[PDB]
Amino acid sequence: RVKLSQRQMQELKEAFTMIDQDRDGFIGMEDLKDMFSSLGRVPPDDELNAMLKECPGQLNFTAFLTLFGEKVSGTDPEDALRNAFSMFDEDGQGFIPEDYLKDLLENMGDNFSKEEIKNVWKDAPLKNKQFNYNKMVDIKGKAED
């Protein structure tokens, strides 16, 4: 839980700050739509506000961390995840053999739903009906494709 490590919080410090400039630290309505300008994408009213709903009211940086109290829940650190995928990759990199991984998630450990399985297949980095884990680990945090 507090797993919101300093690396994660400080990272979130620079995040909440670029926006801000709002009357002494408050990611307000404008702070947001303004952001979506240098963001290169569309900003919708109602939604911009629906995002506020999530915290009691008024977003400093503290509440901004408390808001991310669903992000921490599972987030095992950076590397840890890559090593975890490693264990099922004998043939060094190029990665895991699709079948395996399916049987691995679908009917072993904490079984995956035939529905959770697809949510995963839709994106899943694949080729030669084989999986790409380092590219999947990347997607988790994501620095883009």
Partner: protein, 156 residues
């Protein structure tokens, strides 16, 4: 009689691992009672495992932790599980010259032809794992084999 609190906690530990691997749901496929039991330190023969609930193919039967507990202690009632003493008198039945050496061709023959036959693969594995070498024809020390096998994969 009756297991202890710590004994139970132990079985549970091996148990959780096992049902985790065939799908965490509180059940372990019966075709895994022997492996399960081996992970608790025991060395059951296939006759013992079958007379206690093991099946051959998966998907047939399942056991909760509470059902396996009694199987574990019944199982552990038997005492001729085997001693160094016993394994030694047996190898000597085959020790032609009485030095403690036996052709690895023969031991492997024993292991794959006699008793509850073992697989070609399983024989190589245990020989590689116990690091037991054969010489020119200054073969295999069968006691070397016995001790390492009885000592387990994780010595120290």
């Amino acid at each position: 009689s009756q297991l202890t609190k710590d004994e139970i906690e132990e079985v549970r530990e091996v148990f959780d691992l096992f049902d985790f691997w065939d799908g965490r749901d509180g059940d372990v496929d019966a075709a895994k009672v022997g492996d399960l039991l081996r992970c608790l330190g025991m060395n059951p023969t296939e006759a013992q495992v079958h007379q206690h609930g093991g099946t051959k193919k998966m998907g047939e039967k399942a056991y909760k932790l509470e059902e396996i507990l009694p199987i574990y202690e019944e199982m552990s009632s038997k005492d001729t599980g085997t001693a160094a003493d016993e394994f030694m008198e047996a190898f000597k039945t085959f020790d032609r010259e009485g030095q403690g050496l036996i052709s690895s061709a023969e031991i492997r023959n024993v292991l794959k032809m006699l008793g509850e036959r073992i697989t070609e693969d399983q024989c190589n594995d245990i020989f590689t794992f116990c690091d037991i070498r054969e010489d020119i024809d200054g073969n295999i020390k069968y006691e070397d084999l016995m001790k390492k096998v009885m000592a387990g994969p994780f010595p120290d």
